[PDB]
């Protein structure tokens, strides 16, 4: 049914066809294919959690998009001193469509 995959120091719950947002994969261009290391597989009542078995299972996904998230506005401030640092940030992300979960 679905599988647990790690993608850049973060775990996700993915089924075939899902579009998921992961930390930027700078090495991969749009349309490329990337293999994700699986950490759990759940197929109905069958739960595959043996790490040796899982070491061979790789979830195949396609790099759909490169995009940037919403803008976050940041302010450092301490009263009565005049300290004030203003800063902005837009985290960059990659959307990948999961294509296969080998059994």
Partner 1 sequence: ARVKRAVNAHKKRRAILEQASGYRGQRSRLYRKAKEQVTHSLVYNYNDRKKRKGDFRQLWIQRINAAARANGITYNRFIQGLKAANVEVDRKILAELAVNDANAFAALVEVAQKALPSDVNAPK
The contact set with partner 1 (CB under 8 A) reads 4, 10-13, 39-40, 42, 45, 47, 49, 51, 72-77, 84
In the complex, minimum distance from the CB of residue 34 to partner 1, in angstroms, rounded to a whole number? 20
DSSP 29-67: -TT-EEEEEEEEEEETTEEE--HHHHHT-EEEEEEEEEE
Choose the contact partner of 23 out of RNA, partner 1, none; CB within 5 to 8 A by kind.
RNA
Q: Judged by CB under 7 A, which of 23, 32, 35, 65 binds RNA?
A: 23
Among all chains, which residue has been given the structure tokens 């749009």?
30
Residue 59 φ then ψ, to 5°: -85, 125
Among all chains, which residue has been given the structure tokens 């059994």?
103
Q: Which is nearer to RNA, 10 or 102 (CB)?
A: 10
Mention every residue, 6+ apart, whose C-beta is less than 8 A from residue 40: 3, 4, 47, 48, 49, 54
Q: Judged by CB under 7 A, which of 29, 71, 76, 86 binds RNA?
A: 76
With CB under 7 A as the contact rule, which of the stretches 2-10, 12-20, 38-46, 48-56 interacts with RNA? Answer: 2-10
């Amino acid at each position: 049914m679905y599988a647990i995959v790690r993608s850049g120091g973060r775990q996700h719950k993915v089924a075939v066809g899902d579009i998921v947002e992961v930390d930027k994969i700078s090495t991969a261009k749009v349309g490329d294919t990337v293999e994700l290391s699986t950490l759990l597989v759940v197929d109905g009542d069958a739960v595959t959690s043996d790490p040796w078995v899982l070491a061979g299972i790789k979830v195949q996904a396609e790099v759909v998009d490169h995009h940037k998230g919403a803008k976050i506005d940041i302010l450092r401030y301490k009263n009565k001193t005049g300290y004030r640092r203003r800063q902005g940030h837009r985290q960059q992300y990659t959307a990948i469509k999961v294509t296969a979960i080998p059994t």
